[PDB]
């Protein structure tokens, strides 16, 4: 998982990427309360985080070397042998991970919730693989609703994305889904100051991801779909 009263999401609550107010639902799920819960591909939010932290090459506001970042996470590891028809038990041609963030309608009672998943893939047909995922959402949307039901929580949106990879013969694959919980550094906030704690957040609440990059002098790395996970 969760992200409640004490939290905000990069790209959504802060550093909002317009992709949100331009995205259309892939479908809906009936919540216990009788309302629909639109589902979107979490691509925007994923790209957003990338802009903030930076990459191994174009490093930005990544976590301090040796810091302790608590993360709501899960993962999976599998072996793809050298052609070998005998593909043991936990082996496959590819591996995948998925993550979902559902925001509550009323953040003052209900916490927003994360739902992750991961697994191994069996057919070397990557093209196929995607279809599986394209369906998995429906699978997750269901569990999500169930949990909601479990706590009488009600969400308004829900964004889900994935990450996959085909291992070469003899290559071990590791698929991870992870939500990190951080605090932001001063210099990443324009016109902020160590002495204006609450104001510093308000700045982030307002700055859209685009503006941020500009005001910071950062080139958009997410560019036009430049990122594949």
């Amino acid at each position: 998982x969760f992200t409640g009263v004490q939290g905000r999401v990069i790209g959504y609550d802060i550093l909002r990427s317009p992709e949100v107010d331009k995205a259309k639902p892939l479908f809906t799920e009936t919540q216990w309360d009788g309302s629909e819960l639109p589902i979107y591909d979490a691509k925007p939010l994923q790209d957003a985080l990338v802009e903030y932290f930076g990459t191994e090459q174009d490093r930005r506001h990544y976590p301090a070397p040796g810091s302790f970042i608590v993360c709501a996470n899960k993962g999976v590891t599998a072996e793809r042998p050298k052609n070998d028809a005998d593909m043991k038990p936990g082996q496959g041609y590819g591996v995948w991970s998925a993550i979902a963030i559902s925001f509550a309608k009323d953040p003052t009672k209900d916490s927003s919730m994360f739902v992750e998943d991961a697994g191994v893939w069996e057919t070397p047909n990557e093209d196929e693989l995607l279809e599986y995922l394209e369906g998995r959402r429906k699978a997750m949307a269901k569990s999500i609703a169930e949990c909601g039901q479990d706590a009488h929580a009600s969400f308004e949106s829900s964004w889900i994305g994935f990450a996959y990879t085909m291992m070469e013969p003899g290559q071990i694959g590791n698929a991870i889904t992870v939500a990190p919980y951080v605090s932001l550094p001063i210099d990443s906030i324009p016109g902020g100051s160590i002495l204006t704690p609450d104001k510093d957040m308000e700045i982030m609440e307002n700055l859209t991801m685009p503006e941020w990059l500009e005001k910071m002098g950062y080139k958009s790395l997410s560019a036009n779909n430049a990122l594949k996970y």
Binding site: I10, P63, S67, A163, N174, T177, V178, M201
Partner: protein, 81 residues
């Protein structure tokens, strides 16, 4: 925002500042300012050539995955669920 205004009356605040220069810090780490947290969504995957040492094979794949895209490099990762 209009929201915080309702939380502040419950005793909740969502300020999360890192006293470090440029670097982000883990929630709960000492020296951080504010009682809140910012979170994000990272999904990625990495591979390593199968040696016999499973653990090490995983450690590395994991490492290459953390390093891929949204960089969360040399991080001590705690787990919550």
């Amino acid at each position: 925002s209009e929201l915080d205004a309702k939380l502040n009356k419950l005793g909740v605040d969502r300020i999360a500042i890192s006293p470090y220069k440029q670097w982000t810090r883990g929630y709960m780490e000492p020296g951080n300012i504010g009682n809140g947290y910012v979170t994000g969504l990272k999904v990625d995957a990495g591979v390593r050539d199968k040696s016999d040492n499973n653990v090490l094979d995983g450690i590395v794949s994991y490492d290459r995955a953390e390093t891929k895209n949204a960089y969360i490099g040399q991080i001590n990762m705690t787990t919550a669920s």
